[PDB]
């Protein structure tokens, strides 16, 4: 059944981008999804996401601009230290600063560049490029 | 308002569709009769005709193709060519006119006009291969694939094809400024039609 809504959201995004759509609706919403969308907005992969309220849960409405090649969720959510990031970079990305690993830390969801600047690790949940 | 009194459109049969449909044509569709027949809106036809007139008037006359494999579209196309200086290929479109420079009549135009993208699937393909824009008259059963301007029109009626190409020629001449105004165009709509 439904195990992970984050993966569903990200795959729906990849497919709609690959086929050339403008807007994308994500039915089972959460707070991780909002935070991931926030990171992606700050880094410049989407535009103008908003939350719509029905009585069940939230829905997310997103606009795409054509700056995504791939996007997906990392399972299992691997723990990672502040000393072993290049490994997962080489594993999930095509160049040395190209895309974003999204990490979940005890200080919030962030990109691995910010996490490394602060000097902390965490768990891996997604990647985008 | 209109380019022509609405009842003339209606008597020609511009608002008559097939017993089929297509998601790509829900815009141009307006209604469904109790018989299964679909009805097209005429406002959008008028506007797309004006736009197409401007577009084709912005081009060199003698680099323009008009193609109609259908039989009720060979005479209208021929007179459109006579009136606008544009080339017209009624019958068959020998495959290779655009891709084979070793045929007798080899040409490479700038824009293409099509009466039915389903019957004229050969010219459409060659045009796609050489990379040019496409103006097509489309009905309810037609798709919009490889089509950059679409004119909603009944494609199978002789009166409809005649009226459409008549309006198009008039608009092209106007926007080109070969004439001062409409009603300076004294060709009758009863010439463009196929004779019996």
């Amino acid at each position: 059944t439904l195990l992970d809504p984050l993966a569903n959201a990200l795959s729906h995004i990849t497919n709609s981008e690959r086929v050339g759509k403008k807007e994308v609706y994500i039915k089972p919403a959460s707070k991780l999804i909002g935070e991931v969308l926030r990171v992606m907005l700050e880094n410049g992969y989407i535009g103008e996401f908003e939350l719509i309220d029905d009585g069940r849960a939230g829905i997310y409405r997103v606009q795409l601009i054509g700056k995504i090649n791939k996007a997906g969720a990392i399972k299992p959510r691997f723990p990672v230290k502040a000393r072993d990031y290049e490994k997962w970079e080489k594993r999930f990305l095509p160049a040395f600063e190209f895309g974003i690993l999204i990490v979940s830390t005890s200080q919030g969801v962030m990109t691995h560049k910010e996490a490394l600047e602060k000097g902390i690790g965490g768990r891996l949940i997604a990647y985008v490029y | 308002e209109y380019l022509v009194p609405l009842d003339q459109y209606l008597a020609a049969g511009v608002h008559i569709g097939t017993q089929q449909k297509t998601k790509d044509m829900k815009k141009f569709i307006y209604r469904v009769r109790q018989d299964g027949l679909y009805v097209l809106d005429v406002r959008k036809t008028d506007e797309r005709l004006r736009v197409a007139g401007k577009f084709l008037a912005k081009f060199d006359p003698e680099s323009i193709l008009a193609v109609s494999v259908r039989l009720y579209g060979q005479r209208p196309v021929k007179k459109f060519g006579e009136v606008t200086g544009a080339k017209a290929i009624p019958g068959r479109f020998l495959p290779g006119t655009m891709t084979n420079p070793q045929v007798k009549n080899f040409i490479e135009p700038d824009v293409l006009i099509v009466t039915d993208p389903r019957a004229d699937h050969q010219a459409l393909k060659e045009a796609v291969e050489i990379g040019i824009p496409i103006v097509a008259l489309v009905d309810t059963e037609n798709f919009l694939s490889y089509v950059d301007i679409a004119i909603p029109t009944n494609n199978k009626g002789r009166k409809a094809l005649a009226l459409i190409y008549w309006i198009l020629a008039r608009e092209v001449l106007y926007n080109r400024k070969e004439i001062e105004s409409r009603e300076d165009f004294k060709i009758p709509v009863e010439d463009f039609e196929m004779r019996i």
């Binding site: 054509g66 095509p94 160049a95 040395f96 | 490479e108 990379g131």
Partner: protein, 223 residues
């Protein structure tokens, strides 16, 4: 030199050839990203005179194929050939014939007609310079059963790939790369076409205006 030697005895058949012969198209990069069709090799002989040098004309594969009739066996020759300016322009062609010279000539003509431009850069974790000696990011290519993946490498790492890929990337202007493959790589035609498509797919990756100076991206000729 031989510009007036190649341009005087040529009469254009198409409209692009006429545009080139008159002098309104003057650089190689003005013929690509439009929907133009290329049906004359003299267009490329005019815009890239370097593809005519014999040292830029690798012949890759020659095969002998047989068709049965009740009389005997009819023999045909198939030649896979590569052409390229060594500064970002490559072409691949196949030619058939009843003898070997005809096949070679047709292969080189079809290779001239199938010209593409590519992007170059550094993109490696271990070099991080800004010079177009490699590809700027990893790319994928496929043909038949063959799958190829190309990854950027550091300077001095010369072309870790099979020999057909070696020659194609050398004609492309690339000097450093790592590679992975799957499938029937012993069939030269499919391997060559997969590497050609991998090189083509460098234009399919979206980038932001900040990546062009991080990786030193160059489109076509450099400097």
């Amino acid at each position: 030199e031989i510009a007036q030697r190649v341009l005087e005895e040529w009469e254009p058949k198409t409209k692009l050839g006429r545009l080139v012969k008159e002098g309104q198209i003057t650089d190689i990069h003005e013929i690509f990203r439009k929907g133009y069709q290329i049906k004359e090799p003299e267009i490329v002989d005019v815009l890239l005179p370097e593809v005519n040098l014999r040292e830029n004309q690798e012949v890759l594969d020659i095969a002998l194929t047989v068709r049965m009739t009740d009389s005997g066996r009819r023999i045909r020759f198939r030649v896979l050939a590569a052409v390229g300016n060594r500064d970002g322009y490559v072409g691949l062609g196949i030619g058939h014939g009843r003898e070997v010279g005809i096949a070679i000539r047709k292969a080189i003509n079809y290779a001239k007609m199938n010209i593409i431009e590519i992007k170059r850069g550094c993109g490696s974790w271990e070099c991080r310079c800004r010079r177009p000696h490699s590809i700027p990011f990893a790319v994928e290519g496929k043909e038949g059963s063959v799958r190829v993946k190309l990854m950027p490498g550091p300077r001095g790492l010369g072309l870790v790939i099979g020999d057909v890929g070696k020659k194609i990337l050398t004609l492309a202007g690339v000097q450093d790369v790592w590679s992975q493959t799957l499938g029937e790589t012993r069939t030269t035609v499919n391997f060559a076409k997969a590497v050609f498509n991998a090189l083509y797919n460098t234009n399919r990756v979206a980038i932001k205006p900040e990546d062009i100076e991080r990786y030193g991206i160059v489109v076509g000729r450099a400097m």
